[PDB]
Design an enzyme around this catalytic site. Structure first.
Site, PDB file in Angstrom:
ATOM      1  N   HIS A   1       0.843  -1.195   0.000  1.00  0.00           N
ATOM      2  CA  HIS A   1       0.000   0.000   0.000  1.00  0.00           C
ATOM      3  C   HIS A   1       0.878   1.245   0.000  1.00  0.00           C
ATOM      4  O   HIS A   1       0.625   2.196  -0.726  1.00  0.00           O
ATOM      5  CB  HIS A   1      -0.948   0.009   1.204  1.00  0.00           C
ATOM      6  CG  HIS A   1      -2.193   0.793   0.972  1.00  0.00           C
ATOM      7  ND1 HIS A   1      -3.086   0.471  -0.027  1.00  0.00           N
ATOM      8  CD2 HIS A   1      -2.686   1.900   1.581  1.00  0.00           C
ATOM      9  CE1 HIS A   1      -4.094   1.328  -0.006  1.00  0.00           C
ATOM     10  NE2 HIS A   1      -3.869   2.215   0.948  1.00  0.00           N
TER      11      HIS A   1
ATOM     12  N   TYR B   1       2.428   9.658   1.965  1.00  0.00           N
ATOM     13  CA  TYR B   1       1.694   8.674   2.741  1.00  0.00           C
ATOM     14  C   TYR B   1       2.668   7.974   3.656  1.00  0.00           C
ATOM     15  O   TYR B   1       3.846   7.829   3.333  1.00  0.00           O
ATOM     16  CB  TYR B   1       1.023   7.654   1.853  1.00  0.00           C
ATOM     17  CG  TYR B   1       0.272   6.556   2.596  1.00  0.00           C
ATOM     18  CD1 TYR B   1      -0.917   6.829   3.246  1.00  0.00           C
ATOM     19  CD2 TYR B   1       0.723   5.243   2.585  1.00  0.00           C
ATOM     20  CE1 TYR B   1      -1.630   5.833   3.898  1.00  0.00           C
ATOM     21  CE2 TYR B   1       0.020   4.239   3.227  1.00  0.00           C
ATOM     22  CZ  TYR B   1      -1.162   4.538   3.884  1.00  0.00           C
ATOM     23  OH  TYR B   1      -1.884   3.559   4.541  1.00  0.00           O
TER      24      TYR B   1
END
Ligand SMILES: [Cl-]
Lengths: 106, 97
Positions: B27, B40
Protein backbone atom coordinates in the site's frame (compact mmCIF):
# COMPACT_ATOMS: atom_id res chain seq x y z
CA UNK A 1 15.53 3.60 13.29
CA UNK A 2 13.56 6.21 15.24
CA UNK A 3 11.39 5.24 18.17
CA UNK A 4 7.87 6.65 17.80
CA UNK A 5 5.07 6.91 20.33
CA UNK A 6 1.53 8.09 19.51
CA UNK A 7 -1.00 9.38 22.07
CA UNK A 8 -4.77 9.75 21.65
CA UNK A 9 -5.72 12.77 23.81
CA UNK A 10 -9.10 13.53 25.40
CA UNK A 11 -9.77 17.04 26.78
CA UNK A 12 -9.89 17.13 30.57
CA UNK A 13 -13.28 17.80 32.14
CA UNK A 14 -13.78 21.42 33.25
CA UNK A 15 -11.90 23.26 30.49
CA UNK A 16 -13.06 24.87 27.26
CA UNK A 17 -11.98 23.93 23.75
CA UNK A 18 -9.96 27.18 23.67
CA UNK A 19 -8.08 26.42 26.90
CA UNK A 20 -7.37 22.89 25.65
CA UNK A 21 -5.92 24.18 22.40
CA UNK A 22 -3.74 26.66 24.35
CA UNK A 23 -2.56 23.87 26.71
CA UNK A 24 -1.61 21.77 23.64
CA UNK A 25 0.32 24.71 22.16
CA UNK A 26 2.16 25.27 25.41
CA UNK A 27 2.86 21.56 25.71
CA UNK A 28 4.44 21.73 22.24
CA UNK A 29 6.59 24.72 23.16
CA UNK A 30 7.77 23.00 26.36
CA UNK A 31 8.81 19.88 24.39
CA UNK A 32 11.84 21.68 22.89
CA UNK A 33 13.58 21.59 26.27
CA UNK A 34 12.98 17.90 27.06
CA UNK A 35 16.19 15.85 26.99
CA UNK A 36 16.20 12.70 24.85
CA UNK A 37 13.19 13.86 22.83
CA UNK A 38 14.03 14.30 19.18
CA UNK A 39 10.73 15.77 18.04
CA UNK A 40 7.18 16.28 19.32
CA UNK A 41 3.98 17.06 17.47
CA UNK A 42 0.47 17.72 18.71
CA UNK A 43 -2.54 18.27 16.46
CA UNK A 44 -6.24 18.70 17.10
CA UNK A 45 -8.77 16.32 15.67
CA UNK A 46 -10.84 18.63 13.46
CA UNK A 47 -13.18 15.90 12.20
CA UNK A 48 -13.99 12.24 12.81
CA UNK A 49 -15.79 11.07 9.66
CA UNK A 50 -16.06 2.20 2.41
CA UNK A 51 -14.20 -0.14 4.79
CA UNK A 52 -16.12 -1.12 7.98
CA UNK A 53 -16.08 1.60 10.65
CA UNK A 54 -13.90 1.14 13.76
CA UNK A 55 -15.63 2.17 17.03
CA UNK A 56 -13.34 3.82 19.56
CA UNK A 57 -14.12 6.71 21.91
CA UNK A 58 -14.09 10.45 21.18
CA UNK A 59 -10.57 11.86 20.65
CA UNK A 60 -9.71 15.59 20.81
CA UNK A 61 -6.04 15.64 19.83
CA UNK A 62 -3.11 13.45 18.90
CA UNK A 63 0.40 13.76 20.31
CA UNK A 64 3.43 12.02 18.86
CA UNK A 65 6.98 11.64 20.19
CA UNK A 66 10.16 10.77 18.31
CA UNK A 67 13.36 9.39 19.92
CA UNK A 68 16.61 8.77 18.03
CA UNK A 69 17.50 5.58 19.90
CA UNK A 70 17.20 3.57 23.14
CA UNK A 71 19.89 5.70 24.75
CA UNK A 72 17.88 8.88 24.08
CA UNK A 73 14.77 7.26 25.43
CA UNK A 74 16.62 6.28 28.61
CA UNK A 75 17.79 9.90 29.10
CA UNK A 76 14.23 11.03 28.49
CA UNK A 77 12.84 8.64 31.08
CA UNK A 78 15.46 9.67 33.72
CA UNK A 79 14.95 13.42 33.19
CA UNK A 80 13.20 15.67 35.76
CA UNK A 81 12.38 18.11 32.94
CA UNK A 82 10.65 15.26 31.10
CA UNK A 83 8.83 14.43 34.29
CA UNK A 84 7.49 18.01 34.73
CA UNK A 85 6.40 18.03 31.09
CA UNK A 86 4.46 14.73 31.68
CA UNK A 87 2.63 16.27 34.60
CA UNK A 88 1.49 19.09 32.34
CA UNK A 89 0.38 16.64 29.63
CA UNK A 90 -1.33 14.34 32.05
CA UNK A 91 -3.27 16.97 33.87
CA UNK A 92 -3.95 19.53 31.12
CA UNK A 93 -4.09 17.72 27.79
CA UNK A 94 -5.22 14.22 28.88
CA UNK A 95 -2.09 12.27 28.11
CA UNK A 96 -2.43 8.64 29.08
CA UNK A 97 -0.42 5.78 27.56
CA UNK A 98 0.88 5.74 23.99
CA UNK A 99 0.77 3.39 21.01
CA UNK A 100 4.33 2.35 20.13
CA UNK A 101 4.69 2.13 16.36
CA UNK A 102 7.14 0.36 14.00
CA UNK A 103 7.97 0.79 10.29
CA UNK A 104 6.45 -1.75 7.88
CA UNK A 105 9.71 -2.38 5.99
CA UNK A 106 12.20 -5.09 7.13
CA UNK B 1 -1.43 24.70 4.82
CA UNK B 2 -1.18 20.98 4.27
CA UNK B 3 -4.20 18.74 4.79
CA UNK B 4 -3.51 15.69 6.99
CA UNK B 5 -5.74 12.67 7.49
CA UNK B 6 -4.88 9.95 10.02
CA UNK B 7 -6.26 6.43 10.07
CA UNK B 8 -6.36 3.74 12.72
CA UNK B 9 -6.30 0.42 10.83
CA UNK B 10 -7.46 -3.03 11.97
CA UNK B 11 -6.55 -6.09 9.92
CA UNK B 12 -9.19 -8.37 8.38
CA UNK B 13 -10.50 -11.33 10.28
CA UNK B 14 -8.20 -14.32 9.90
CA UNK B 15 -5.33 -12.48 8.21
CA UNK B 16 -1.79 -13.17 9.42
CA UNK B 17 0.44 -10.42 10.81
CA UNK B 18 2.87 -11.45 8.12
CA UNK B 19 0.40 -10.81 5.29
CA UNK B 20 -0.94 -7.64 6.92
CA UNK B 21 2.57 -6.08 7.14
CA UNK B 22 3.33 -7.05 3.55
CA UNK B 23 0.07 -5.52 2.30
CA UNK B 24 0.75 -2.30 4.28
CA UNK B 25 4.13 -2.14 2.55
CA UNK B 26 2.52 -2.73 -0.87
CA UNK B 27 0.00 0.00 0.00
CA UNK B 28 2.87 2.34 0.84
CA UNK B 29 4.66 1.51 -2.44
CA UNK B 30 1.47 2.19 -4.41
CA UNK B 31 0.98 5.53 -2.66
CA UNK B 32 3.81 7.16 -4.63
CA UNK B 33 1.74 6.99 -7.82
CA UNK B 34 -1.55 8.45 -6.55
CA UNK B 35 -2.55 11.83 -8.00
CA UNK B 36 -3.14 14.60 -5.47
CA UNK B 37 -1.52 12.70 -2.62
CA UNK B 38 1.71 14.40 -1.50
CA UNK B 39 2.92 11.79 1.00
CA UNK B 40 1.69 8.67 2.74
CA UNK B 41 2.99 6.83 5.77
CA UNK B 42 1.90 3.60 7.38
CA UNK B 43 3.31 2.17 10.59
CA UNK B 44 2.50 -0.98 12.52
CA UNK B 45 1.41 -0.77 16.14
CA UNK B 46 4.05 -2.73 18.06
CA UNK B 47 2.65 -2.06 21.48
CA UNK B 48 -0.75 -0.67 22.55
CA UNK B 49 -1.83 1.07 25.76
CA UNK B 50 -6.86 -3.40 19.12
CA UNK B 51 -5.30 -1.24 16.35
CA UNK B 52 -2.88 -2.96 13.97
CA UNK B 53 -1.53 0.03 12.06
CA UNK B 54 -1.62 3.74 11.73
CA UNK B 55 -1.82 5.33 8.27
CA UNK B 56 -1.45 8.99 7.40
CA UNK B 57 -2.12 11.04 4.23
CA UNK B 58 -0.81 14.53 3.35
CA UNK B 59 -2.35 16.76 0.65
CA UNK B 60 -0.80 20.15 -0.24
CA UNK B 61 -4.17 21.94 -0.46
CA UNK B 62 -7.90 21.59 -1.21
CA UNK B 63 -7.27 21.35 -4.98
CA UNK B 64 -4.85 18.46 -4.50
CA UNK B 65 -7.45 16.72 -2.32
CA UNK B 66 -10.05 17.44 -5.04
CA UNK B 67 -7.73 15.88 -7.66
CA UNK B 68 -7.19 12.84 -5.43
CA UNK B 69 -10.89 12.36 -4.79
CA UNK B 70 -11.64 12.56 -8.54
CA UNK B 71 -8.88 10.07 -9.48
CA UNK B 72 -9.52 6.53 -10.77
CA UNK B 73 -5.98 5.72 -9.63
CA UNK B 74 -6.92 6.71 -6.10
CA UNK B 75 -10.06 4.54 -6.39
CA UNK B 76 -7.83 1.54 -7.32
CA UNK B 77 -5.59 2.33 -4.36
CA UNK B 78 -8.66 2.26 -2.11
CA UNK B 79 -9.69 -1.09 -3.65
CA UNK B 80 -6.27 -2.38 -2.57
CA UNK B 81 -6.94 -0.98 0.91
CA UNK B 82 -10.06 -3.20 1.08
CA UNK B 83 -7.68 -6.19 0.72
CA UNK B 84 -5.90 -5.67 4.06
CA UNK B 85 -8.03 -3.20 6.12
CA UNK B 86 -10.95 -4.89 7.93
CA UNK B 87 -11.91 -1.77 9.90
CA UNK B 88 -10.80 1.86 9.85
CA UNK B 89 -11.19 5.07 11.92
CA UNK B 90 -10.34 8.22 9.98
CA UNK B 91 -9.48 11.64 11.49
CA UNK B 92 -8.77 15.01 9.95
CA UNK B 93 -6.17 16.82 11.99
CA UNK B 94 -5.38 20.46 12.46
CA UNK B 95 -2.47 22.39 13.97
CA UNK B 96 -2.85 23.72 17.52
CA UNK B 97 -1.47 27.10 16.42
CL1 LIG C 1 16.69 16.80 33.20
Amino acid sequence: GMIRLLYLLVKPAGMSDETFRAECLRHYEMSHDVPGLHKYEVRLVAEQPHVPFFDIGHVDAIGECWFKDDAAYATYMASDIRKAWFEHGKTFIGQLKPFRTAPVAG
